[PDB]
Amino acid sequence: FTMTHWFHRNPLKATAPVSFNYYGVVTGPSASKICNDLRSSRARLLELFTDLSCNPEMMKNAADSYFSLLQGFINSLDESTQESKLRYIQNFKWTDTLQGQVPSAQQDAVFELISMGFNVALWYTKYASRLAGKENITEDEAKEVHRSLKIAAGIFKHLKESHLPKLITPAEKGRDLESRLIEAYVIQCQAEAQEVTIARAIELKHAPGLIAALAYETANFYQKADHTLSSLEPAYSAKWRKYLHLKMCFYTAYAYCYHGETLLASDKCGEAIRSLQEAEKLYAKAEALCKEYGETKGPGPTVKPSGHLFFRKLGNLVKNTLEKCQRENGFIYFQKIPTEAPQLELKANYGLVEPIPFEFPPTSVQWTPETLAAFDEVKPVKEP
Amino acid sequence: THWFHRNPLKATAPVSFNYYGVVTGPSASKICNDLRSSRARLLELFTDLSCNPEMMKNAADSYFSLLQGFINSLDESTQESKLRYIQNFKWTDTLQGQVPSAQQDAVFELISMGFNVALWYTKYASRLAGKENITEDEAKEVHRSLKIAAGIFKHLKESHLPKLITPAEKGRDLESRLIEAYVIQCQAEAQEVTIARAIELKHAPGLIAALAYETANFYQKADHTLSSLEPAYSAKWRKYLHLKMCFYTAYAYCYHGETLLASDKCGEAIRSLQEAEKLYAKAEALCKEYGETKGPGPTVKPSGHLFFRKLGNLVKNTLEKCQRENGFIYFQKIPTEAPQLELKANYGLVEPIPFEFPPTSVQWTPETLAAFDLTKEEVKPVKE
Amino acid sequence: DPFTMTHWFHRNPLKATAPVSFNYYGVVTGPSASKICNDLRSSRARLLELFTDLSCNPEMMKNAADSYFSLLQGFINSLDESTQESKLRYIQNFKWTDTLQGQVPSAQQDAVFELISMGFNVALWYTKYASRLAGKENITEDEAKEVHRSLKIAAGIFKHLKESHLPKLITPAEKGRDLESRLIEAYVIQCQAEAQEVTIARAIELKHAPGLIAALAYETANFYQKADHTLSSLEPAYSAKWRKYLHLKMCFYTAYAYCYHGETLLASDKCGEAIRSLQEAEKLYAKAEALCKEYGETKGPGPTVKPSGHLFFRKLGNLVKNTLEKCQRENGFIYFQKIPTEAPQLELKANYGLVEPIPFEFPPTSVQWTPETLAAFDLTKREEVKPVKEPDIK
C-alpha cells in the first residue's frame, strides 16, 4: 500500500565510448558484424542506464546482448584454449563510484566485463530505490523492488567470486573492482532487501518476535558492511559508512522495540521498558548520525535522511510502545526495571534473504573459429 | 442464506374413515369424524404458506394421536390393534412422480404421513433460509427444523419400517436406504447453518475447517447411500449431494489453509487453497450439470446463487493473502500434492432431535374399540 | 482513558482537632526555641486547613505534612541517638474527634497520640483526594495514575501507624476509635482493594486476558470480605454503614469474577459452564443491588452521592447481560452444551495486578532541633474542637 524507505546511492560509473573499430586487423563481413554489434549494443546498454523507461527485463536483455558478444574477447570457443586471443586488444576507461571523475584504465576485456557488470548491478539498486519511492506503488511493484535488490546482490557476488581474481592488475583501494568494496555492496543489497521484508511483516501484523529478529539480522548486515569498508580512507568512504552506520543503529532500534513487545506479551513489562529505553537511545543515535551524514562530504543522494518520514515512523513507534509499556507497568504489572539493556540473541527463522545467483550469458553464436580467425575521453553520466 | 434442493411433497388419496356397518355408537362415530378431519387439516397445512412449526406439531399430534388406535393395543397385553388392516392408504413418492403405491396397513399410513411431516420441516427450513431478512431466531428455527426432521426420519426407519408386512420396492420413500439418505441430508444441511454462524462469530479456522469437512462427509455419505438406486429417478438428487460435498471440501481446504498459515506453513497453505480453488470450480461444473439433469426439481437454480459466490470470494481473497505472505515474508515452496484432511470437529456436530409419536388418543377406550364390529380413491396431487 | 475511571467509594468523615498554640510561658527562652514553637504552630495550622482545601495537591500535602511532622518529631525522638525519648513528649494535650464517633472528642497528653491522629488524617485525606479525583468526568491518564498512587500511599501510612507507632501509646484507645488496631487494619485492606478496583477497570480497558481480570476481581472481593470481617467485633451502631459498603463491594466483585470467569470458560469451548458462571454473576449483581438499596436505609456518616443507580454498578449490569447473551447465542448456534446446576467454586489467584501499600516513614527529625534549642526548653520552670465541614459528606 505504501513504502517508506530512504536509500543512499553512490553515483553510476561512467566510461569512454568504444568504437570497436580496428580497420586494419578486422577482415571479412562477419568479423565486421560483431564489431558493429559490439559498438551498438554497448552504446544501447550505456544509454539505458539513464533511460527512465528501462525496466528490469529490458536491462537484462540489453546486458545479455552486449555481454554475449563481449565474452568473445575473454572466453575460448574451443572449450579448450585458455583464453581468447582478444583479451588485451582494447583499452577501457571507467570512473569509479567513490572516486569522482578520476578514471582508471585497463587493456583487459575482463576489466570491461566486471566494470560494466558492476554498473548493471548498480542500476538494479537504483531501479529499486526509485520504484520504492513511486507515489502509488502497487504490491507487484514492491515485490519487484525486493527482487531487484536480490538480483544486484547476486551480480555483485558473482563478479567478486569468479571474475575479480582474473584481473591481471589488481585494483587499488577505493576502486569499485576491489574485493572489499564489492563485498560491501552484496551485504548492503541483502540488507536493503530485508528492509522491505520488515516493513511488510509489520503492515501484515506479524508476531513481534519475528520482526525483532529480522530487524536484528538486518542491523548486523549493515554493521558487517560498515566493518568491511573500514580499510578505506575516510576522504571518499566516510559518507557511505555513515549511512551504513545509521541503518545499523536504526534497525537495532527496531529490534529492541519489537523485542520489547515480545517481553510485554510474556508479562515481563519491566524488562520491556528497559528494552524500549535502549531503543530510544539507538533512535537518538540514529538521528545524530542523520545530521552527521548531511554534514559529511562525498557523493550523495538529493534527499537527505534527517527528518525523513522513515525515521519519524520509528520515533513514534518507540514512543508509543514505551508509553504503552509504562502504562501497563504503572497500572498493572508494577515490575522492576532492570538497569542494563537486554542481550539480543535473536535468530530470524523466516524472511532472511539470499542473493539471486547470477551468470553471464553464453558466448554469442556469432563467434566462430572462422570469425575469430578474421582478427589479425570519458562521457559522464547524468542522474536526476 | 443457503440453497437446499427439495424433492416434491407426498400426495395421498383422501380417506373418509367411513365404515358404515362397522361403527355403531356416537363415540366410535366421533372418533372416525375426528380422524377424517384431523387428516384433512394436516394435509391442508402441508401447502399452507402460513403454517409454522407449532401449527404443524399440533396438527400432527392430533391426527397421529388418533391414528395409533388403528395400530397400538390399549390392553398393555395384546400385540396389536384389531383395526390395523381396515383401511387402504394410497401415497405418491418423492422420487416416483405420480405413480402411486397403496397398502391396506395403518402402519403404512403412519410412516407415509410421518415422512411427509418431516419433509415439510425440511421445506419450512429451506424457505426460511431463503430470505436475507432472517432473524437470529429465524436462523435457529431453520437449524431446529432440520434436526427435528432428521429425528422423525430416523425414528421411522428404526422403530416402524420393520413393522410393514410387505416392504416397499427400491426407489420408494419407505425403503430404508432412501430414508437413511434423508436423515443424513438433514444433518448435513443443519451443519451448513452451524458453519455459517461459526464464521459470523469469528471462530477458529480449525473448528470451521473441521465442521466443513464433516458436512462434506455427510453429503458424500448421503450420496453413497443412494448409489444403489436407479439413475433415472435419483440422478438429479445425487448431483446436489455431490456438488454440496465438493463445495464444503473447498470450504475445508480454505479454512485449513488459514490454520496452516497461522503455523507459518505458507507453502502448504497455498497448496491447500489451490485445492479449494479446484474443488470450487468442480462445484460450479456440477452446478451447471444440476440444471441440465432432468429429475424431480425445485424452483430456484444454484449457479450464481449468492451462497455460491461467497465461497469463491473467500477462496480468492485467502489465496491472495497466502500468496502475498509468501511473496513478501515466507518464501516457501508449494508442495505438489494437496494435503490430506484429517480433521476432528470437537464441537458443533449435529445430532437429530429424537422423535416419538404422541401417546394413543384418550378417545380410544376398550368400550369405543368394542363399538367397532369388523364382522361387517384418487390421489390428490400436491401443488406447492 | 475512555470512561474507565467511574467509581463509587464510601468515605467516613475526616478527623477534627482542637487548635494548639504550642505556647509554654515560663518554659521557653530565646529566639531558637521560640521560633520552633512558632514553626510548630503555623505548621500544624497550615496542614489542618489543607484537608478541606479543594486546591490541595498530593505535592502540597506531602510538603505540609513533612514540615509539621519533622518539627513534631522533636517532642518524641531523642537527638542523642541514645536517650530513650524526648523530654517533651508529655507537655502538650491533644484533642481529636474520631471518624466513627461523631463529635465526641478524645484527648491525650502524648505527642505520639498527635503524631498518629494527624498521620491518620493525612492517609484519610489521600483516600478522599482519590475518590474525589476519580469522579472527574474528563480525567486524564496522569490523574487516574494519581488516584491509584494516592490510595497506595494512604495504605502505607495506615500500615506504618499500626505497626510502628500504635504500640508506643501508653493508654490504649477503646474499641470504636481510630487509634485501634482492627479499625486501622480495615483501612489498610480497604485502600488496597479500592486501588485494585482501578487496576481492574484498566485491565478491562487494555483488553487483558479474562482470566487475569477474573482473578483480580476475586482477590479484590476477598479483600473486601477480609476488611468487613476485620470490623466484625465493632458495635453495629457506628460500624454498620461502613460494613454494608464492604459487604456490597465484595458481592459486586464476586460478580465481576464469575463474569470474566465465564469468558475464560467460553474461550475454553466450555459454553455450558460459561452460562452457569454468568448466571451466578447475575445473582450476585442482584444481591449487590439489594445491598445498595439497604445501604441508604442504613444509618451513619456517608458520601453525598448515592450508590444505587450509579454508572459504576450499571456498568457491571450491562456486562453480565451482554456476556450472558453472547454465551447463550453461542450455545444456541454452535455449542449446544448442557448447563451444570451448580455454580463453579472460584479458586482464582492473580499473577499480576495485586496492590501492595507504598511503604511510609515519617520524615527525620527537623534539623531545627538541636541540643542547644532543646536546652532552651526549661521544664524546671512552671480548648474546643474546630469541627470540619466537607461538601462530599452528608
Numbering used by the authors:
A (entry chain B): -1 to 374, 391 to 398
B (entry chain C): 2 to 377, 390 to 397
C (entry chain A): -3 to 378, 390 to 401
Text lifted from the article:
Bro1 domains are elongated, banana-shaped domains that were first identified in the yeast ESCRT pathway protein, Bro1p. Humans express three Bro1 domain-containing proteins: ALIX, BROX, and HD-PTP, which function in association with the ESCRT pathway to help mediate intraluminal vesicle formation at multivesicular bodies, the abscission stage of cytokinesis, and/or enveloped virus budding. Human Bro1 domains share the ability to bind the CHMP4 subset of ESCRT-III proteins, associate with the HIV-1 NCGag protein, and stimulate the budding of viral Gag proteins. BROX comprises a single Bro1 domain and has a C-terminal “CAAX” farnesylation site (where C is cysteine, A an aliphatic amino acid, and X any amino acid).
The construct used in our studies spanned BROX residues 1–401, and therefore lacked 10 C-terminal residues (402–411), including the farnesylated Cys408 residue. BROX crystallized in space group C2 with three molecules in the asymmetric unit. The structure of the selenomethionylated protein was solved at 2.7 Å resolution using the MAD method, and the final structure was refined against a 2.5 Å resolution data set collected from crystals of the native protein. The electron-density map was generally well defined, including for most side chains, except for a lack of density for the loop spanning residues 379–390, and marginal density for the terminal residues 391–401. The three BROX molecules in the asymmetric unit form a triangle in which the exposed hydrophobic Surface 1 from one molecule packs against the hydrophobic Surface 2 of a neighbor. BROX forms a single curved domain of overall dimensions: 90×37×38 Å. As expected, the structure resembles the Bro1 domains of ALIX and Bro1p, with a core comprising three tetratricopeptide repeat (TPR)-like helical hairpins that pack in a right-handed solenoid (helices α4–9). The TPR core is flanked on the wider side by a two-stranded hairpin (β1, β2) and a helical bundle (α1–3). As in other Bro1 domains, an extended loop traverses the length of the domain on the concave surface (BROX residues 332–365). The convex face of BROX does indeed have strongly basic character, as predicted by this model.
